[PDB]
Design an enzyme around this catalytic site. Structure first.
Site, PDB file in Angstrom:
ATOM      1  N   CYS A 149      26.790  42.750  46.330  1.00  9.98           N
ATOM      2  CA  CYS A 149      27.791  43.329  45.432  1.00  9.98           C
ATOM      3  C   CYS A 149      27.443  44.769  45.049  1.00  9.98           C
ATOM      4  N   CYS A 154      31.277  44.611  45.822  1.00  6.66           N
ATOM      5  CA  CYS A 154      32.255  44.864  44.756  1.00  6.66           C
ATOM      6  C   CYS A 154      32.176  46.284  44.197  1.00  6.66           C
ATOM      7  N   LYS A 157      33.228  49.194  46.831  1.00  8.53           N
ATOM      8  CA  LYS A 157      34.613  48.889  47.218  1.00  8.53           C
ATOM      9  C   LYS A 157      35.604  49.261  46.107  1.00  8.53           C
ATOM     10  N   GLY A 223      10.719  36.567  52.486  1.00  6.03           N
ATOM     11  CA  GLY A 223      10.191  35.247  52.174  1.00  6.03           C
ATOM     12  C   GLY A 223      10.602  34.154  53.150  1.00  6.03           C
ATOM     13  N   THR A 252      19.546  33.870  48.931  1.00  4.43           N
ATOM     14  CA  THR A 252      19.429  34.869  49.993  1.00  4.43           C
ATOM     15  C   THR A 252      20.767  35.402  50.515  1.00  4.43           C
ATOM     16  N   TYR A 291      40.107  39.303  52.647  1.00 10.35           N
ATOM     17  CA  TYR A 291      40.256  40.291  51.579  1.00 10.35           C
ATOM     18  C   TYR A 291      39.411  41.533  51.853  1.00 10.35           C
ATOM     19  N   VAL A 292      38.265  41.381  52.533  1.00  7.75           N
ATOM     20  CA  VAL A 292      37.427  42.539  52.858  1.00  7.75           C
ATOM     21  C   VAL A 292      38.152  43.470  53.824  1.00  7.75           C
ATOM     22  N   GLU A 295      41.182  45.137  51.827  1.00  6.49           N
ATOM     23  CA  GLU A 295      40.766  46.110  50.811  1.00  6.49           C
ATOM     24  C   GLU A 295      40.304  47.410  51.469  1.00  6.49           C
ATOM     25  N   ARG A 312      44.517  38.144  63.816  1.00  8.07           N
ATOM     26  CA  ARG A 312      44.518  37.005  64.737  1.00  8.07           C
ATOM     27  C   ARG A 312      45.693  36.053  64.466  1.00  8.07           C
ATOM     28  N   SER A 313      45.820  35.543  63.224  1.00  9.77           N
ATOM     29  CA  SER A 313      46.944  34.663  62.879  1.00  9.77           C
ATOM     30  C   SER A 313      47.653  35.148  61.618  1.00  9.77           C
ATOM     31  N   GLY A 318      43.725  30.830  53.213  1.00 14.23           N
ATOM     32  CA  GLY A 318      43.181  30.160  52.050  1.00 14.23           C
ATOM     33  C   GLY A 318      43.787  30.585  50.720  1.00 14.23           C
ATOM     34  N   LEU A 436      31.477  34.372  44.793  1.00 16.83           N
ATOM     35  CA  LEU A 436      31.820  35.476  43.905  1.00 16.83           C
ATOM     36  C   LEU A 436      30.610  35.817  43.052  1.00 16.83           C
ATOM     37  N   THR A 437      30.500  37.090  42.680  1.00 17.63           N
ATOM     38  CA  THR A 437      29.335  37.532  41.909  1.00 17.63           C
ATOM     39  C   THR A 437      29.235  36.886  40.529  1.00 17.63           C
ATOM     40  N   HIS A 566      54.186  44.481  23.871  1.00 18.69           N
ATOM     41  CA  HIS A 566      55.162  45.374  24.490  1.00 18.69           C
ATOM     42  C   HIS A 566      54.800  46.836  24.235  1.00 18.69           C
ATOM     43  N   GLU A 571      53.008  40.895  29.642  1.00 19.39           N
ATOM     44  CA  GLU A 571      53.935  40.178  28.761  1.00 19.39           C
ATOM     45  C   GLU A 571      55.014  39.411  29.526  1.00 19.39           C
TER      46      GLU A 571
HETATM   47  C1  LIG Z   1      57.496  55.239  16.921  1.00 17.38           C
HETATM   48  C2  LIG Z   1      57.565  53.737  17.047  1.00 17.38           C
HETATM   49  C3  LIG Z   1      56.840  53.100  18.053  1.00 17.38           C
HETATM   50  C4  LIG Z   1      56.883  51.710  18.196  1.00 17.38           C
HETATM   51  N1  LIG Z   1      56.146  51.125  19.216  1.00 17.38           N
HETATM   52  C5  LIG Z   1      56.195  49.824  19.345  1.00 17.38           C
HETATM   53  C6  LIG Z   1      55.429  49.214  20.419  1.00 17.38           C
HETATM   54  O1  LIG Z   1      54.719  49.810  21.239  1.00 17.38           O
HETATM   55  N2  LIG Z   1      55.556  47.819  20.473  1.00 17.38           N
HETATM   56  C7  LIG Z   1      56.324  47.025  19.626  1.00 17.38           C
HETATM   57  O2  LIG Z   1      56.340  45.794  19.797  1.00 17.38           O
HETATM   58  N3  LIG Z   1      57.046  47.619  18.630  1.00 17.38           N
HETATM   59  C8  LIG Z   1      56.973  48.950  18.502  1.00 17.38           C
HETATM   60  N4  LIG Z   1      57.700  49.549  17.491  1.00 17.38           N
HETATM   61  C9  LIG Z   1      58.495  48.685  16.598  1.00 17.38           C
HETATM   62  C10 LIG Z   1      59.826  48.265  17.209  1.00 17.38           C
HETATM   63  O3  LIG Z   1      60.543  49.437  17.595  1.00 17.38           O
HETATM   64  C11 LIG Z   1      60.633  47.484  16.169  1.00 17.38           C
HETATM   65  O4  LIG Z   1      59.831  46.404  15.698  1.00 17.38           O
HETATM   66  C12 LIG Z   1      61.959  46.919  16.690  1.00 17.38           C
HETATM   67  O5  LIG Z   1      62.801  47.954  17.200  1.00 17.38           O
HETATM   68  C13 LIG Z   1      62.699  46.138  15.627  1.00 17.38           C
HETATM   69  O6  LIG Z   1      63.960  45.699  16.169  1.00 17.38           O
HETATM   70  P1  LIG Z   1      65.179  45.389  15.236  1.00 17.38           P
HETATM   71  O7  LIG Z   1      66.232  44.680  16.102  1.00 17.38           O
HETATM   72  O8  LIG Z   1      64.688  44.698  14.032  1.00 17.38           O
HETATM   73  O9  LIG Z   1      65.737  46.841  14.822  1.00 17.38           O
HETATM   74  P2  LIG Z   1      66.134  48.150  15.628  1.00 17.38           P
HETATM   75  O10 LIG Z   1      65.561  48.102  17.008  1.00 17.38           O
HETATM   76  O11 LIG Z   1      65.741  49.343  14.743  1.00 17.38           O
HETATM   77  O12 LIG Z   1      67.736  48.079  15.793  1.00 17.38           O
HETATM   78  C14 LIG Z   1      68.622  48.012  14.651  1.00 17.38           C
HETATM   79  C15 LIG Z   1      69.884  48.772  15.010  1.00 17.38           C
HETATM   80  O13 LIG Z   1      70.943  48.525  14.044  1.00 17.38           O
HETATM   81  C16 LIG Z   1      71.565  49.763  13.751  1.00 17.38           C
HETATM   82  N5  LIG Z   1      72.231  49.678  12.456  1.00 17.38           N
HETATM   83  C17 LIG Z   1      71.666  49.869  11.220  1.00 17.38           C
HETATM   84  N6  LIG Z   1      72.504  49.723  10.220  1.00 17.38           N
HETATM   85  C18 LIG Z   1      73.707  49.426  10.842  1.00 17.38           C
HETATM   86  C19 LIG Z   1      74.996  49.164  10.337  1.00 17.38           C
HETATM   87  N7  LIG Z   1      75.293  49.158   9.034  1.00 17.38           N
HETATM   88  N8  LIG Z   1      75.979  48.892  11.228  1.00 17.38           N
HETATM   89  C20 LIG Z   1      75.684  48.894  12.531  1.00 17.38           C
HETATM   90  N9  LIG Z   1      74.508  49.130  13.123  1.00 17.38           N
HETATM   91  C21 LIG Z   1      73.557  49.397  12.220  1.00 17.38           C
HETATM   92  C22 LIG Z   1      70.433  50.777  13.817  1.00 17.38           C
HETATM   93  O14 LIG Z   1      70.941  52.103  13.924  1.00 17.38           O
HETATM   94  C23 LIG Z   1      69.723  50.294  15.085  1.00 17.38           C
HETATM   95  O15 LIG Z   1      70.371  50.795  16.248  1.00 17.38           O
HETATM   96  C24 LIG Z   1      57.675  50.952  17.316  1.00 17.38           C
HETATM   97  C25 LIG Z   1      58.396  51.586  16.310  1.00 17.38           C
HETATM   98  C26 LIG Z   1      58.348  52.971  16.165  1.00 17.38           C
HETATM   99  C27 LIG Z   1      59.145  53.628  15.068  1.00 17.38           C
HETATM  100  C1  LIG Z   2      32.736  43.922  50.975  1.00 21.16           C
HETATM  101  C2  LIG Z   2      32.550  42.888  49.889  1.00 21.16           C
HETATM  102  C3  LIG Z   2      33.259  43.012  48.692  1.00 21.16           C
HETATM  103  C4  LIG Z   2      33.104  42.075  47.666  1.00 21.16           C
HETATM  104  N1  LIG Z   2      33.838  42.239  46.493  1.00 21.16           N
HETATM  105  C5  LIG Z   2      33.685  41.358  45.538  1.00 21.16           C
HETATM  106  C6  LIG Z   2      34.442  41.545  44.305  1.00 21.16           C
HETATM  107  O1  LIG Z   2      35.222  42.472  44.064  1.00 21.16           O
HETATM  108  N2  LIG Z   2      34.201  40.549  43.341  1.00 21.16           N
HETATM  109  C7  LIG Z   2      33.332  39.456  43.490  1.00 21.16           C
HETATM  110  O2  LIG Z   2      33.205  38.652  42.558  1.00 21.16           O
HETATM  111  N3  LIG Z   2      32.624  39.311  44.649  1.00 21.16           N
HETATM  112  C8  LIG Z   2      32.801  40.220  45.617  1.00 21.16           C
HETATM  113  N4  LIG Z   2      32.090  40.063  46.792  1.00 21.16           N
HETATM  114  C9  LIG Z   2      31.202  38.888  46.918  1.00 21.16           C
HETATM  115  C10 LIG Z   2      29.820  39.118  46.336  1.00 21.16           C
HETATM  116  O3  LIG Z   2      29.248  40.259  46.971  1.00 21.16           O
HETATM  117  C11 LIG Z   2      28.944  37.896  46.619  1.00 21.16           C
HETATM  118  O4  LIG Z   2      29.611  36.717  46.176  1.00 21.16           O
HETATM  119  C12 LIG Z   2      27.566  37.974  45.959  1.00 21.16           C
HETATM  120  O5  LIG Z   2      27.004  39.281  46.113  1.00 21.16           O
HETATM  121  C13 LIG Z   2      26.605  36.945  46.514  1.00 21.16           C
HETATM  122  O6  LIG Z   2      25.436  36.890  45.671  1.00 21.16           O
HETATM  123  P1  LIG Z   2      24.114  36.179  46.151  1.00 21.16           P
HETATM  124  O7  LIG Z   2      23.100  36.299  45.009  1.00 21.16           O
HETATM  125  O8  LIG Z   2      24.559  34.829  46.616  1.00 21.16           O
HETATM  126  O9  LIG Z   2      23.573  37.033  47.407  1.00 21.16           O
HETATM  127  P2  LIG Z   2      23.374  38.589  47.681  1.00 21.16           P
HETATM  128  O10 LIG Z   2      24.020  39.388  46.592  1.00 21.16           O
HETATM  129  O11 LIG Z   2      23.882  38.833  49.097  1.00 21.16           O
HETATM  130  O12 LIG Z   2      21.798  38.788  47.575  1.00 21.16           O
HETATM  131  C14 LIG Z   2      20.888  38.140  48.495  1.00 21.16           C
HETATM  132  C15 LIG Z   2      19.737  39.086  48.729  1.00 21.16           C
HETATM  133  O13 LIG Z   2      18.626  38.391  49.347  1.00 21.16           O
HETATM  134  C16 LIG Z   2      18.118  39.201  50.396  1.00 21.16           C
HETATM  135  N5  LIG Z   2      17.402  38.344  51.345  1.00 21.16           N
HETATM  136  C17 LIG Z   2      17.940  37.625  52.382  1.00 21.16           C
HETATM  137  N6  LIG Z   2      17.063  36.924  53.060  1.00 21.16           N
HETATM  138  C18 LIG Z   2      15.861  37.194  52.421  1.00 21.16           C
HETATM  139  C19 LIG Z   2      14.543  36.754  52.655  1.00 21.16           C
HETATM  140  N7  LIG Z   2      14.213  35.903  53.633  1.00 21.16           N
HETATM  141  N8  LIG Z   2      13.566  37.215  51.831  1.00 21.16           N
HETATM  142  C20 LIG Z   2      13.900  38.057  50.848  1.00 21.16           C
HETATM  143  N9  LIG Z   2      15.108  38.542  50.537  1.00 21.16           N
HETATM  144  C21 LIG Z   2      16.051  38.068  51.362  1.00 21.16           C
HETATM  145  C22 LIG Z   2      19.348  39.913  50.951  1.00 21.16           C
HETATM  146  O14 LIG Z   2      18.987  41.040  51.750  1.00 21.16           O
HETATM  147  C23 LIG Z   2      20.053  40.281  49.639  1.00 21.16           C
HETATM  148  O15 LIG Z   2      19.524  41.474  49.066  1.00 21.16           O
HETATM  149  C24 LIG Z   2      32.218  40.996  47.848  1.00 21.16           C
HETATM  150  C25 LIG Z   2      31.514  40.870  49.042  1.00 21.16           C
HETATM  151  C26 LIG Z   2      31.672  41.803  50.066  1.00 21.16           C
HETATM  152  C27 LIG Z   2      30.887  41.648  51.348  1.00 21.16           C
END
Ligand SMILES: Cc1cc2nc3c(=O)[nH]c(=O)nc-3n(C[C@H](O)[C@H](O)[C@H](O)COP(=O)(O)OP(=O)(O)OC[C@H]3O[C@@H](n4cnc5c(N)ncnc54)[C@H](O)[C@@H]3O)c2cc1C
Ligand SMILES: Cc1cc2nc3c(=O)[nH]c(=O)nc-3n(C[C@H](O)[C@H](O)[C@H](O)COP(=O)(O)OP(=O)(O)OC[C@H]3O[C@@H](n4cnc5c(N)ncnc54)[C@H](O)[C@@H]3O)c2cc1C
Ligand SMILES: c1cc(CNCc2ccc3c(c2)OCO3)ccn1
Ligand SMILES: c1cc(CNCc2ccc3c(c2)OCO3)ccn1
Ligand SMILES: c1cc(CNCc2ccc3c(c2)OCO3)ccn1
Lengths: 588, 588
Positions: A149, A154, A157, A223, A252, A291-292, A295, A312-313, A318, A436-437, A566, A571
Site C-alpha cells: 500500500c 493505495c 495510486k 525470512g 508476507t 480495479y488496478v 485506476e 479478456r471478458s 466480482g 484491503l489495507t 443540503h 443526501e
Molecule cells: C444565506 C443562507 C444560506 C443557507 N444555506 C443553507 C444550507 O446550506 N443548507 C440548508 O439546509 N439551509 C440553508 N439555509 C436555510 C434555508 O434556506 C431555509 O431553511 C429554507 O429556505 C426554509 O424554507 P421555507 O419553505 O421555510 O421558506 P423560504 O424558502 O424562505 O420560502 C418562503 C417563501 O414564501 C414567500 N412569502 C412570504 N410571505 C408571503 C406572502 N404573504 N405571500 C406569498 N408568499 C410569501 C417568501 O418570499 C419566500 O419565497 C440558508 C439560508 C440562508 C439565508
Molecule cells: C496497485 C494497488 C492499489 C491498491 N489500492 C488499495 C486501496 O486504495 N485501498 C485498499 O484498502 N487496498 C488497496 N490495495 C491493497 C493493499 O495494498 C493490500 O491489501 C495490502 O497492502 C496487503 O497488506 P499485507 O500486510 O497483507 O502485505 P504487504 O503490504 O504486501 O506487505 C508484505 C511485505 O512482506 C514482504 N515480504 C514478502 N516475503 C517476505 C519474506 N520471505 N521475508 C520478509 N519479508 C517478506 C513484502 O516484500 C512486503 O513488504 C492496493 C493494492 C495494489 C497492488
C-alpha cells in the site's frame, strides 16, 4: 469457560499484571515496573463482569487469591512484597527477560498487517522482531519499509488520481470566473513522481522511527519458517542464520502476475514499476480489467496519455456488473479506449528504453479477439494488471505443516490461527478474506491484543466497504444486486435507485445523468439494506459513514427517517423512492 | 382505535379508493379513474396488518363491507357498479369536483417547504393552489420562484464557495506537476455571478413547469389569512380578491434583520443582495458571526477580497465552541481579519454606488469595543448578517386565532397543526424546529401524505445533521461537547478525538494538524455516540452517512467494529482511541 480463558491468557502473555483500580498495593507494583521501563499488560478485575470468578481461578496458578499478581511467560512471579524484593535486589530485570526463545513474536513481512501487529504486541511487553525484504522486480525496481500500500499501492495510486482530478478542476475554474486558459497548460510526469516519492520516503522513515520507539527489532532480511518456532533469515550479504520465537505471524502479502507469453517479463511492466517510473509511459496499453488496471488507465488518460485497455471478458469481475459498466462507459467517454474480448499473444521489442535521455522504448503487441480476428498495434509502454499471487514456497518449508488452499493462500480459523498452533496469518495471504489495507491492520492489531493482553474481540470481515478510484469514483458496501437475487430470489428483492448531478457540475456544464446510486433491499426482512452502491465524486467519503449503519442492520425505513444535509451528493440516499420494478425512469 | 384513523382519513382525503391488489373489480374502477384523468389516493387493505378491521369500519360510512369503495371529500360515492354508472352517464367529473371550497389546499409561500407540500398533495387528487411573492429588499432586489435556499441561500452560497475552493486547486496543481503559474491568474466576479444566476434561472423555470405538470395553480400574489378558510390575495396590479380552501399551509419563511443604527438600511446590504450583486464588493466589512456571516466572509477572501468580520461576542453561537474556534482560526490564518468584541454605531456614506461604471461606493463605519475603545475604518461594502426573522403580521390576521411565540414563530403540535384546526405551519416559521431546507421538504411532504392519503408517519426533528461551508468545512450531528456535559455531568462523558491530514494535502504542502474530529459519548449508556464533529474537506459528504447510524443508536463499539475505506478522511472515525481525559496529544 472463564478458566479456559485464564489459562490461555496466562500461557501466552509476555508480562501481565492482575490488579484492581483502587488497590494501592497494585499501584506500588505499577510504579516499580514503570520506573524500570518494563512494559506489560494489565487486567483490572473490578472492571470485568466476572472479575470475582477470575480472581478465584488465579489461585490454580499462584496458590493465592489476592491482587496484585504478576506473571512472566506463564510463570507466577509474585505479589507486591515479592516483586519489590526482586527489584530491591537487582533481580527483576533478569526475571522479566527470561525466555525459552529469542522473541515472544516474530512477524515475517513488514507491510500493512505486519507493522500493525508488531507495534501493538510490543506495547504489552512482547519482545518483537519484524522482518521485511523486497524482492526486486524483473527490471530491478525496489523500495523501503511499509509494504504494498505505502510504496506501490493505495498511497501513490490515489496521489496520481488526485493529479488527474486537478485537470478537471482547471477546466471547471474558467466557468466559475478564473482567468486561466486550460488549453495552454501541460503536465510534467517527473515533477509529479518526485513529489509522490518524497512523501513515500517520509513514510518509510516514519515506520523505522516507530519501530525504534516501540523497541521492536527491525531486520531488513528475508525470512523462512523451517519449523514451528525457527525462522531462517538471509542477510543483504547473504549471511544465513536462525532465530527462534514463541508466536509467529505470517504477513508476507502478494506480488503481480505476468501472463506466460513471449516478451511479457522482458519488455512489459507492472504496477510495481509504474509509481517510480523515471519517464512518462507515453502511448500505453493496459492488459487486464481489475480495479488496478482501470485506476491506472484512468489517471494516465487524465494526465494526457493515449491509453488502451485490453479486456479478456468483463470489467471488475466480482463487483456489481451494472456499476462496472457505468464505470467503463464514463472512462470511454473521457478518452480511454477499450479492446474488448481480447487477449495478448506476444510482445516484440522495437526500441530499447532510453535511460540516458529519459524516454520509453517501443513495442509491438499481437493478440486475438474471441472470434479469432487478429489484434496488432504499437505502444511505448505495456502494463500488465492480470492479478496478484502469494509465493509462500519462498516463505514456508513444507515440513512445518501449515495448510494452504488451491490458490496458495493460508487456511486459518476465525482467530487467524493456522494448522500449526503457534503460527498465525494475516493480510492478503489469509484465504477467503477481503484484500484491503484496513482489514489487514484491524486483523493484526486485534490478534496482537488476544495473544499478549487477554483480549477476546475477533475481526469482523463481513460487509466491508470498498472504493474504486476510477476517474468517476465507485463506492460500495454489501452485496451486488445479482448476488442478492441469486441468494434470495428476484421476488424477495427491491432496488431503489436514482441518478443525480453534483451542484458543482452545474455551472461547470458537466453531464446531467451520469452519477448514479442504488439501495438493494430484502422485502421479507423489513426491507433490510443488503447493498449500497454509488458512482460519483468523493464516493469513498460518501460511502464510509453508511458502512456503520449497515453493520448495525439498517433498513430502508432507517434511511427514510434520517434527514439529508443540503447541498451534498450523499443526501440523495435519504430520499430514494423510484423502484426498478416500477419501470419508472431514475433520471433527474 | 382503528376506527378514528379511518374517520380522519375519510373526512380529509379529496378522492380516496379502498382496494385490494387481487381484486378485478377494483382494477376496473382504477382503469376508469385513470382514463378520466382523476387522481386519487389508494389504500390496498390486504397490505395492512389490520386490513380486516378497517374493512368492517368502512360499513359505518357506506353500509357495505366489500371492496372497492370510492369516497370524495368525506362522502361515500359507490361500489364498482355505481361508479361505472356515473362514468357512462357523464356524471363522474361533476361529482369528483364538487366541493365547499375553491381548493382542497392553499399553500402560502413558494419555497423549500411550500412547493414540496403542494406537489405532494396534488398527487393524491387534492385541488391545490400555491401562492408566492418576493417583497423586494431596500435597494430593490427581487427574484423568482423557489424560496430562500434556491435564490439567495444554500444554492448560490455553495456555488461561490466552490469558486473559492478552486483557487486552492489552482495552487495545488503546480505541486502535482501542472505547468500553470497561480500568481498570474485573477478572478472575474461578474462572470461568476452570471453563471450562478443562469443556474438559479433554470431552477425558477423547473419549479413553474413542475407545478403545471401536477395541475397545481400558481399565483404570483401576496397572500393573507383573514379567517380559518379565507385567503385574501393581492395582484401584481394591486388587485385584491378572496379565495377559499379546506386546509391551509403557512410556509412563508424569514428575511434578514438590520441593526437599528443610522445608515444601515440606506447604505449596507445583506445576503439577499449579495448573490446577484453586479459589481465586486471590494474591501468588505461583514457584521455578525453566524454561519451566514462566516460562509460569506470566507469565499470573498478566497476570491481575492479584503475582508473583515466584526464580532460582538463569539463565533457560531449555539454550535460546539471548540469547533467554532478552530473554524475561525483557520480563516484568520488564510486572510480574514476579525474585529473582536466589537459592535457598530453608524454607517456614513462617502461615495454613492456607481451604477454606470459598475463600481461600489465608499462607506465610513463607526463603532466601539466592549472595553470602551473606538472603531473607525472605511469600506466599500458593508454586509449585515445579524439574524433572520418572520413577519407574520404581514401574513396572518390577529383575529384568526393562530398562536405565535415571543419571537413571532408559529406554535405547533408534533404534526404541524396550529391552534386553528385546519391551518398548519412548516419550515422556518415553525417554532423550535431546525431551520434547514431538507427539514422543510420532509415536513411538507409528510404532512401532505397525512392530510390526503391516510398516512401516519411524523417528521423526526431530532439529531438532524448540519454542515457549515466555511473555507475549511465543519460537519456535525447531535450534541456539542458542552451540551452533553451539561445534560449528563462531566464524569459520564467520554470524548475520543484526533487530528488528521488529507492525503491530498501531503504533496501540496498544506498544514499537518488543522483538520480535527471527535466523538462525544455517554459512558453509562454503553458509550452511546451523543455527538459527532468533523473539521475538514468534504465535511458534508463525510458526515451524512453517520447520521443514519446515530439515528439507529450507534455506540463507540459500532464505530470500532466497522472497517475503514482507505485512503479517505472519513476512515479516521473507525479507529479513534485517544481520549480527552487521558491528556494524550491528538496530533498526527
Ligand atoms: C444565506 C443562507 C444560506 C443557507 N444555506 C443553507 C444550507 O446550506 N443548507 C440548508 O439546509 N439551509 C440553508 N439555509 C436555510 C434555508 O434556506 C431555509 O431553511 C429554507 O429556505 C426554509 O424554507 P421555507 O419553505 O421555510 O421558506 P423560504 O424558502 O424562505 O420560502 C418562503 C417563501 O414564501 C414567500 N412569502 C412570504 N410571505 C408571503 C406572502 N404573504 N405571500 C406569498 N408568499 C410569501 C417568501 O418570499 C419566500 O419565497 C440558508 C439560508 C440562508 C439565508
Ligand atoms: C496497485 C494497488 C492499489 C491498491 N489500492 C488499495 C486501496 O486504495 N485501498 C485498499 O484498502 N487496498 C488497496 N490495495 C491493497 C493493499 O495494498 C493490500 O491489501 C495490502 O497492502 C496487503 O497488506 P499485507 O500486510 O497483507 O502485505 P504487504 O503490504 O504486501 O506487505 C508484505 C511485505 O512482506 C514482504 N515480504 C514478502 N516475503 C517476505 C519474506 N520471505 N521475508 C520478509 N519479508 C517478506 C513484502 O516484500 C512486503 O513488504 C492496493 C493494492 C495494489 C497492488
Ligand atoms: C532469494 C533472495 C535472496 C536475497 N534476500 C536477502 C537480501 C538480499 C539483498 C538485500 C537484503 C536482503 O536487504 C537489502 O538488500 C536470498 C535467497 N533467495
Ligand atoms: C472467553 C473469555 C471470557 C473471559 N472474559 C475475556 C475478556 C473480555 C474483555 C477483555 C479482556 C478479557 O481483557 C481485556 O478486555 C469468558 C468466556 N469466554
Ligand atoms: C411582472 C413582474 C412580476 C414580479 N412581481 C410582480 C408583483 C409585484 C407586486 C406584487 C405582486 C407581484 O404580488 C403582490 O404585489 C411578476 C409578473 N409580471
Amino acid at each position: 469457560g472463564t478458566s479456559q480463558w485464564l489459562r490461555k491468557t496466562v500461557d501466552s502473555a509476555a508480562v501481565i499484571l492482575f490488579s484492581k483500580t483502587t488497590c494501592p498495593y497494585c499501584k506500588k507494583v505499577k510504579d516499580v515496573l514503570a520506573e524500570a521501563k518494563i512494559k506489560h499488560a494489565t487486567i483490572e478485575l473490578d472492571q470485568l463482569s466476572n472479575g470475582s470468578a477470575i480472581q478465584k481461578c488465579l489461585a490454580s496458578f499462584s496458590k493465592i487469591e489476592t491482587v496484585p499478581q504478576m506473571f512472566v511467560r506463564g510463570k507466577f512471579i509474585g505479589d507486591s512484597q515479592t516483586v519489590l524484593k526482586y527489584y530491591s535486589n537487582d533481580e527483576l530485570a533478569g526475571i522479566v527477560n527470561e525466555s525459552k526463545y529469542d522473541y515472544d513474536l516474530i512477524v515475517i513481512g513488514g507491510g500493512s498487517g505486519g507493522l500493525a501487529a508488531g507495534k501493538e504486541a510490543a506495547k504489552y511487553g512482547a519482545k518483537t522482531a519484524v522482518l521485511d525484504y523486497v524482492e526486486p522486480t524483473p527490471i530491478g525496481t525496489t523500495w523501503g519499509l511499509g509494504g504494498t500500500c505505502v510504496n506501490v499501492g493505495c498511497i501513490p495510486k490515489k496521489l496520481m488520481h488526485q493529479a488527474g482530478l486537478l485537470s478537471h478542476a482547471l477546466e471547471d475554474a474558467e466557468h466559475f470566473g478564473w482567468s486561466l486558459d486550460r488549453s495552454k497548460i501541460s503536465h510534467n510526469w517527473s515533477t509529479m513522481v518526485e513529489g509522490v516519492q518524497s512523501h513515500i520516503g517520509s513514510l518509510n522513515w516514519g515506520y523505522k522511527v516507530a519501530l525504534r520507539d516501540n523497541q521492536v527489532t527491525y531486520l531488513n532480511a528475508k525470512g523462512r519458517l523451517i519449523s514451528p518456532h525457527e525462522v531462517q533469515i538471509t542477510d543483504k550479504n547473504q549471511k544465513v542464520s536462525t532465530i527462534t520465537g514463541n508466536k509467529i505471524i505470517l504477513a508476507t502479502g502478494e506480488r503481480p502476475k505476468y501472463p506466460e507469453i513471449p516478451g511479457a517479463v522482458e519488455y512489459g511492466i507492472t504496477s510495481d514499476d509504474l509509481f517510480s517510473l523515471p519517464y512518462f509511459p507515453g502511448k500505453t496499453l493496459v492488459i487486464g480489467a481489475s480495479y488496478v488496471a482501470l485506476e491506472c488507465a484512468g489517471f494516465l488518460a487524465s494526465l494526457g496519455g493515449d491509453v488502451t485497455v485490453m479486456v479478456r471478458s468483463i470489467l471488475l469481475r466480482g463487483f456489481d456488473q451494472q456499476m462496472a459498466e457505468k464505470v467503463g462507459d464514463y472512462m470511454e467517454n473521457h478518452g480511454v479506449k477499450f479492446a474488448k474480448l481480447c487477449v495478448p499473444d506476444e510482445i516484440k521489442q522495437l526500441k530499447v528504453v532510453d535511460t540516458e535521455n529519459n524516454k520509453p522504448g517501443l513495442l509491438l503487441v499481437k493478440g486475438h479477439y474471441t472470434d479469432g480476428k487478429k489484434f496488432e498495434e504499437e505502444f511505448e509502454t505495456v502494463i500488465f494488471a492480470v492479478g496478484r499471487e502469494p509465493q509462500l514456497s519462498k516463505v514456508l518449508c513444507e515440513t512445518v505443516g501449515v495448510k494452504l488452499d488451491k490458490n496458495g493462500r493460508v487456511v486459518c480459523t476465525d482467530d487467524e490461527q493456522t494448522t500449526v498452533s503457534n503460527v498465525y496469518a494475516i493480510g492478503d495471504i489469509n484465504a477467503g478474506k477481503p484484500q484491503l489495507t484496513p482489514v489487514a491492520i484491524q486483523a493484526g492489531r486485534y490478534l496482537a491484543r488476544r495473544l499478549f493482553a487477554g483480549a477476546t474481540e475477533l475481526t469482523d470481515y463481513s460487509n466491508v466497504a470498498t472504493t474504486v478510484f476510477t476517474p468517476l469514483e465507485y463506492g460500495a458496501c454489501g452485496l451486488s444486486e445479482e448476488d442478492a437475487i441469486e441468494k434470495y430470489g428476484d421476488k424477495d428483492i427491491e432496488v431503489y435507485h436514482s441518478n443525480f448531478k453534483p451542484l458543482e457540475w452545474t455551472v461547470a456544464h458537466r453531464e446531467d445523468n451520469v452519477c448514479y446510486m442504488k439501495l438493494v433491499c430484502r422485502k421479507s426482512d423489513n426491507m433490510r439494506v443488503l447493498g449500497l452502491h454509488v458512482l460519483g465524486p468523493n464516493a469513498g467519503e460518501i460511502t464510509q459513514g453508511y458502512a456503520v449503519a449497515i453493520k448495525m442492520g439498517a433498513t430502508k425505513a432507517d434511511f427514510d427517517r434520517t434527514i439529508g444535509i443540503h447541498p451534498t451528493c450523499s443526501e440523495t440516499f435519504t430520499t430514494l423512492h423510484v423502484t426498478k420494478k416500477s419501470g419508472v425512469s431514475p433520471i433527474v
